[PDB]
Design an enzyme around this catalytic site. Structure first.
Site, mmCIF file in Angstrom:
data_model
loop_
_atom_site.group_PDB
_atom_site.id
_atom_site.type_symbol
_atom_site.label_atom_id
_atom_site.label_comp_id
_atom_site.label_asym_id
_atom_site.label_seq_id
_atom_site.Cartn_x
_atom_site.Cartn_y
_atom_site.Cartn_z
ATOM 1 C CG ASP A 433 5.259 -7.792 -2.205
ATOM 2 O OD1 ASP A 433 6.035 -7.036 -2.824
ATOM 3 O OD2 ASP A 433 4.785 -8.856 -2.666
ATOM 4 C CD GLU A 476 5.771 -3.250 -5.196
ATOM 5 O OE1 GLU A 476 6.856 -3.053 -5.808
ATOM 6 O OE2 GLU A 476 5.221 -4.377 -5.069
#
Ligand SMILES: [Ca+2]
Ligand SMILES: [Ca+2]
Ligand SMILES: [Tb+3]
Length: 650
Positions: A433, A476
């Site tokens: 993330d 990401e």
């Protein structure tokens, strides 16, 4: 052998399910299904998109009412013993299709005199004069999935042909309701926008066969690690309590979150997944810890309140997290009770050596991606070189597996904590993330340590390991496209591709419009990989593709990500004043066995096809030139496929 008047003979679309399709004009007509001399009819009225009970034929047949012209699908389901059935409607410079068989020139692709299977239908044909004639089956959307009939089973797993299923465990399957309310968590009794619905690892483990049938070979789960126990104000208006149901608000990286299950539950998840040839990915965070909540402040004795004396228990209660907003308040109102300026109070939290945050005596957040406080989240100091010891508040958390280690920095602890899971359970990879808010070096350290951890486990567990492949890591980085950025040289094997979503959208009404995107991607991705998606938890659910979303994603070059419920058109749910929340709606299992059953079957078939052919994910594309329809060939090593789309049936 299933039939009804003025519709073609039904073909099998899944075990025990038979369907038929036809373009039908408006009007009224009787409805009976015949299976030889067996006659059945709807016994409980006729509606669209509902499981209709059926009785043996008697008297006048039920009158079915056709309101709107379009392609209708009749389905009959014999899995319950007694036949139920279902009706459904599918409401240009685009190739048109008359509905009749296609004759394909396969002279440059499949050998004269050989057998070619359309995988979707199962129909096999012999190449004669460099040509085969095939009818696209019902549910294909006019597709032929052409392979050598020799093709029998899945091809060896490659990350560049991976079908990744991304699931928010809490919103998937509730295997055990007992653990739904860990650490005093509650349902809101409203629309449960931001609460723990109760989905767990056990439940997820129960659906591995279902995932295996879709041709899923990588399972990306939300972080199972211990989150903040409490909640914050949800959305711009505080119209719901926001709990850490998604896994992005971590508190202790060393422990499982009790909502998810036990250590044994994880071991079973991973081991059973491996048995089915499915790899496991943890969603991981190193950028931030979760917000401060009342639950955590009370439990671990940190933070500072404006409420002093009797006023504290009378406002917030015996358990502060049981507080609910009264009249004139929102779920943000509790913030007015908290004194965020108190230095000594808030030092008792993570501590000055661990995080950046505009609270107390902490280092203030910077004004760049790396040092900013993302949405007011405590920013972990990954770049720090200071020996930190454990987080201050861990002194009041005796259930932690986190030990102080001589010489360790905050980053060293984090990479150790994540790698230990890889070492202990044999986790195949990570999805990272907030990749652009942590320095590249930290990610490299994570990858190095995780790579070593996995190798150690595979050596310790030779019976269990599927191969000797190295640890995998995707990330990401917000807005990343089909490009080999510097992330690829700091430990990322692939980055998530934000651009495919919009391209697929442009091909929602006409599949052939994706051709240019697919050609570019197939060429570009000869030298690297990406993870592409239609739907995500921080964009939207892709539902504009009619029935064609499967082929739009699964026939994409590079690795692809199924967001849970794409296969069953899981609807956007209640979202309140946070536009993203609806994307984390509950999995629509009732639809899966009912109105979305043929959709699920469609995904299973196209996914199974991809799993058989690396050329899909990895191969070079040649787009065919034809007078009717759209078609391409892809080729990787000895593997070769031809995909034909007949075009629009109307
Ligand atoms: Ca549960
Ligand atoms: Ca940061
Ligand atoms: Tb930057």
């Amino acid at each position: 052998a299933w039939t009804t008047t003025d519709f073609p003979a039904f073909t099998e679309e899944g075990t025990g399910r038979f369907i038929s399709q036809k373009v039908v004009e408006k009007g009224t007509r009787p409805l009976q299904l015949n299976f030889d001399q067996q006659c059945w009819q709807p016994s409980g009225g006729i509606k669209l998109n509902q499981m209709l009970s059926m009785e043996p034929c008697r008297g006048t047949p039920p009158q079915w009412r056709i309101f709107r012209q379009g392609l209708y699908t009749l389905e009959v389901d014999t899995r319950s013993g007694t036949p139920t059935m279902m009706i459904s409607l599918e409401e240009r410079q685009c190739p048109k299709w008359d509905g009749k068989p296609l004759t394909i020139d396969v002279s440059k692709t499949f050998a004269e005199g050989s057998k070619v299977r359309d995988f979707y239908s199962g129909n096999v044909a012999t190449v004669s004069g460099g040509k085969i004639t095939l009818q696209p089956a019902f549910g294909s959307n006019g597709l032929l999935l052409l392979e050598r009939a020799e093709t029998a089973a899945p091809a060896p797993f490659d990350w560049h042909n991976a079908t990744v299923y991304f699931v928010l465990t809490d919103r998937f399957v509730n295997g055990n309701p007992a653990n739904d309310n860990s650490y005093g968590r509650h349902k809101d009794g409203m629309q449960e926008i931001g609460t723990f619905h109760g989905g767990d690892l056990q439940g997820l483990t129960s659906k591995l066969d279902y995932l295996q049938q879709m041709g899923v070979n990588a399972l990306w789960i939300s972080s199972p690690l211990e989150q903040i126990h409490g909640w914050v104000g949800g959305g711009t208006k505080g119209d719901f309590p926001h709990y850490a149901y998604h896994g992005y608000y971590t508190q202790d990286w060393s422990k499982l979150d009790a909502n998810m299950g036990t250590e044994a539950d994880l071991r079973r998840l991973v081991d059973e997944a491996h048995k089915r040839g499915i790899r496991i990915l943890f969603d991981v965070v190193m950028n931030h810890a979760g917000y401060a909540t009342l639950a955590d402040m009370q439990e671990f004795q940190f933070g500072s309140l404006y409420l002093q004396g009797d006023e504290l228990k009378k406002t917030l209660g015996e358990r502060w997290t049981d507080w609910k907003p009264g009249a004139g308040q929102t779920w943000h109102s509790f913030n007015d009770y908290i004194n965020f300026s108190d230095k000594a109070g808030w030092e008792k939290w993570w501590g000055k050596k661990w995080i950046r945050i505009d609270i107390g005596d902490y280092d203030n957040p910077g004004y760049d991606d790396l040092t900013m406080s993302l949405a007011f989240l405590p920013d972990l100091k990954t770049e720090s070189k200071e020996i930190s010891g454990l987080p201050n508040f861990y002194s009041h958390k005796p259930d932690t597996a986190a030990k102080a280690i001589p010489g360790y920095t905050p980053r060293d602890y984090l990479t150790h904590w994540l790698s230990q899971w890889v070492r202990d359970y044999g986790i195949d990879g990570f999805r990272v993330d907030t990749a652009k808010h942590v320095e590249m070096d930290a990610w490299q350290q994570l990858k190095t340590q995780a790579t070593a951890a996995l190798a150690e486990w595979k050596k310790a567990n030779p019976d269990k390991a599927l191969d000797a492949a190295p640890f995998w890591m995707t990330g990401e980085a917000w807005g990343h496209g089909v490009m080999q950025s510097d992330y690829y040289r700091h430990g990322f094997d692939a980055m998530i591709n934000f651009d495919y979503q919009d391209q697929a959208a442009k091909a929602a009404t006409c599949m052939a419009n994706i051709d240019l995107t697919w050609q570019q991607m197939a060429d570009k991705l000869q030298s690297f990989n990406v993870l592409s998606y239609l739907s995500s938890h921080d964009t939207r659910l892709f539902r504009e593709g009619g029935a064609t979303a499967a082929e739009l994603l699964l026939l994409a070059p590079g690795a692809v990500q199924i967001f849970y419920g794409d296969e069953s058109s899981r609807p956007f749910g209640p979202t309140g004043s946070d536009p993203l929340q609806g994307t984390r709606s509950e999995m629509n299992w009732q639809d899966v066995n009912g109105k979305a059953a043929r959709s699920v079957t469609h995904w299973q078939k196209i996914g199974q096809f991809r799993a058989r052919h690396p050329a899909i994910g990895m191969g070079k594309q040649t787009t065919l030139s034809m007078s009717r329809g759209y078609g391409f060939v892809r080729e990787s090593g000895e593997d070769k496929v031809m995909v034909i789309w007949a075009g629009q049936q109307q």
